[PDB]
Amino acid sequence: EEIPGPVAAWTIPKAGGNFGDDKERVTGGMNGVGSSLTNIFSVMFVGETGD
Amino acid sequence: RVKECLTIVMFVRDMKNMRFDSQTKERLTSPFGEIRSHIQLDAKKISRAIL
Amino acid sequence: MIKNEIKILSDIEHIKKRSGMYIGSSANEMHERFLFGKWESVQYVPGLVKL
Ligand SMILES: Nc1ncnc2c1ncn2[C@@H]1O[C@H](COP(=O)(O)OP(=O)(O)NP(=O)(O)O)[C@@H](O)[C@H]1O
């Protein structure tokens, strides 16, 4: 299925741009599951990303 | 008994190849060679400055 | 220039390349531990004992 960017980042786990090489990445993220973990335990949620 | 009487405020910026052992992410399991190669902090300055 | 290439690994290569995540400390280190009644300082490799 074709799912766009922010909704796959916020609803489906194992999704992120932090799955790169360990020798270059300065960010602390390694899971891809985080905003899904935020969104699952929320009864209301709205999220806007302008690019 | 030496190290039991200190409070330490350590903030480290711009590190690479971080490894934490849990999704809790509360503690670093990175190898000490990468951390020792990245850190160029003069700890002997801290030792003479608290001596 | 640093090299940013996103790599996805299978689980055998994920364990074999990121060995500190799953078997703990993978270096020859020293610990003060209980052995047969005595708290003594001894040096070993924790991965074999973990497995
Ligand atoms: N609001 C957001 N802003 C930026 N990136 C986001 C956002 N929500 C989700 N993402 C992306 O999706 C991922 C969120 O899941 P998460 O589990 O945080 O992954 P991680 O950052 O790789 N691991 P970790 O931070 O250790 O939990 C991030 O890696 C981002 O790439």
Q: What is the dihedral of CA C50, B15, A32, A47, to 10 degrees?
A: 150
Q: How far is CA B17 from CA A20, C16, C21, C30, in A?
A: 11, 16, 12, 24
Which resolution in angstroms does this entry have?
A: 6.8
What is the CA(A26)–ligand 1 centre distance, in A?
A: 14
Structural biology method used: cryo-EM
Q: What is the DSSP pairing of strand C29-35 with strand C38-44?
A: antiparallel
Separation CA B29–CA C21 (nearest Å): 7
Residue in B with minimal Cα distance to C20: B29
Q: Ligand 1 centroid to B49 CA: how many Å?
A: 40
From residue A29, give the alpha-carbon distance in Å to each of A32, B22, B24, B25, B28. 8, 12, 12, 10, 13
Alpha carbon of B29: minimum distance to chain C alpha carbons (Å) = 7
DSSP state letters, B7-38: -------S--S--BSSSS--SB---HHHHHHH
Nearest CA to ligand 1 atom 11: A16
The b/e string for B32-51 (b: 16+ C-beta within 10 A; e otherwise) is eebbeeeeeeeeeeeeeeee
